[PDB]
Amino acid sequence: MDNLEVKAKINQGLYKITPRHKGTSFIWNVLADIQKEDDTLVEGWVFCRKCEKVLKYTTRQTSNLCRHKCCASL
Amino acid sequence: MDNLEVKAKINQGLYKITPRHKGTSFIWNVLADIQKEDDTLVEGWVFCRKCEKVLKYTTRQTSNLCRHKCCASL
DNA sequence: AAATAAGCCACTTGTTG
DNA sequence: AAATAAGCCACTTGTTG
Ligand SMILES: [Zn+2]
Ligand SMILES: [Zn+2]
């Protein structure tokens, strides 16, 4: 699945994790953006710094990202 | 929708809320079964005694019933 | 409206007496 | 296996600076 493709490219160093996502939600103290080789952001996925999982990101809602155990601790 | 049909029959007194669901989960101290006029249980739906909402019940998982605010307080 | 997320269910995997 | 539910996402409605 498309989830594992993204995670494989982070482990190889093809994708880098972006210092920060511009917003006001507490989730961004834990979750980060993913960058391709050309410095273009990977659309639709974010990275948890705590568990190192790749989670689906949709701008229409931040509830899945919110209730993810690593964010719910904040 | 089928959710509102069940709730309408509880408000009319056509459906009665059953004293208890046999199980070990804390959710059953708040959630109850629904009975038809002939005393046969309404399959697929449960009733919250606290908020009085009709929630979907599937025997394959109790997670939706679990994280419902009235149960999550226990 | 850009952003955030309550609050229901779907769904697969995992657990446990 | 009967029962319970972690733990991800879908999805519609509602909120708020
Ligand atoms: Zn995490
Ligand atoms: Zn309730």
Side-chain angles (χ1 to χ4, degrees):
Chain A
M1 66 167 57
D2 9 72
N3 174 38
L4 301 164
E5 161 241 333
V6 174
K7 183 61 190 307
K9 306 205 118 204
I10 304 169
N11 287 335
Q12 304 168 41
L14 291 185
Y15 286 180
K16 299 160 109 169
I17 90 147
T18 279
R20 233 164 309 187
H21 183 113
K22 312 299 120 73
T24 53
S25 179
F26 64 95
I27 74 176
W28 307 119
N29 302 314
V30 163
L31 270 21
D33 290 317
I34 315 167
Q35 251 184 348
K36 296 189 203 291
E37 294 97 300
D38 42 26
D39 302 322
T40 288
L41 293 184
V42 167
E43 224 95 18
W45 301 99
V46 289
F47 178 83
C48 185
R49 290 147 155 158
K50 202 169 178 191
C51 66
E52 298 182 327
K53 283 186 181 191
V54 174
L55 317 146
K56 180 96 63 142
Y57 175 52
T58 82
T59 71
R60 58 109 161 264
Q61 51 97 18
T62 74
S63 304
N64 64 302
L65 260 30
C66 206
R67 69 208 181 129
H68 171 67
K69 45 179 181 171
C70 310
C71 308
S73 301
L74 284 71
Chain B
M1 66 167 57
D2 9 72
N3 174 38
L4 301 164
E5 161 241 333
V6 174
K7 183 61 190 307
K9 306 205 118 204
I10 304 169
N11 287 335
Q12 304 168 41
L14 291 185
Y15 286 180
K16 299 160 109 169
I17 90 147
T18 279
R20 233 164 309 187
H21 183 113
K22 312 299 120 73
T24 53
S25 179
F26 64 95
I27 74 176
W28 307 119
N29 302 314
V30 163
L31 270 21
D33 290 317
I34 315 167
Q35 251 184 348
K36 296 189 203 291
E37 294 97 300
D38 42 26
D39 302 322
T40 288
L41 293 184
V42 167
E43 224 95 18
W45 301 99
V46 289
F47 178 83
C48 185
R49 290 147 155 158
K50 202 169 178 191
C51 66
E52 298 182 327
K53 283 186 181 191
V54 174
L55 317 146
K56 180 96 63 142
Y57 175 52
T58 82
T59 71
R60 58 109 161 264
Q61 51 97 18
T62 74
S63 304
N64 64 302
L65 260 30
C66 206
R67 69 208 181 129
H68 171 67
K69 45 179 181 171
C70 310
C71 308
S73 301
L74 284 71

